[PDB]
């Protein structure tokens, strides 16, 4: 499908060279950054969407995540479906697991305190996570059947908000360097 949203946020630290490519393609070169999130997807997320992607390049030199990323409002929730990472595997409060698209994911919840949110400024909000137990190989056509995660999260009392914000396949980094090239559809 055609993506209609381009996400390019940085807290201003270091270098983040994000390129909005043709169609659903984008690339990012970063070094000695603070926090940043770059990706392509949809302006309005959906719990029934099936995301396809191909990471032609996934080379983080430190903390970085290759992950489905999005937000909901009422309540404010930042969610993730992490397929690969760099030197640090994200974790939090273990809830259970879910099998989807050939892999097994651990389900975690965490909370952010006085952190920047989608609406600007800072606040406290919950994060929902689905983290693959082992890194998903890149360079191939991958699929993320989001409904599987949404349903699994639901059975653990992890309900998403009613107002859906953007939903993208992103590259997130934290105080690191690296490169990525991803195509989303």
UniProtKB/Swiss-Prot annotation:
Pathway the protein contributes to: Glycan degradation; xylan degradation
EC top class, as a word: hydrolase
Entry GO MF terms: endo-1,4-beta-xylanase activity
Active site per UniProt: 78, 172
All copies of domain GH11, residue ranges: 1-185
EC number per UniProt: 3.2.1.8
Annotated catalysed reactions: Endohydrolysis of (1->4)-beta-D-xylosidic linkages in xylans
GO terms of biological process kind: xylan catabolic process
PROSITE patterns documented for this protein: GH11_1, GH11_2, GH11_3
Listed Pfam families: Glyco_hydro_11 (PF00457)
Keywords in alphabetical order: Carbohydrate metabolism, Glycosidase, Hydrolase, Polysaccharide degradation, Signal, Xylan degradation
Family: Belongs to the glycosyl hydrolase 11 (cellulase G) family.
Protein's recorded name: Endo-1,4-beta-xylanase
Organism of origin: Niallia circulans
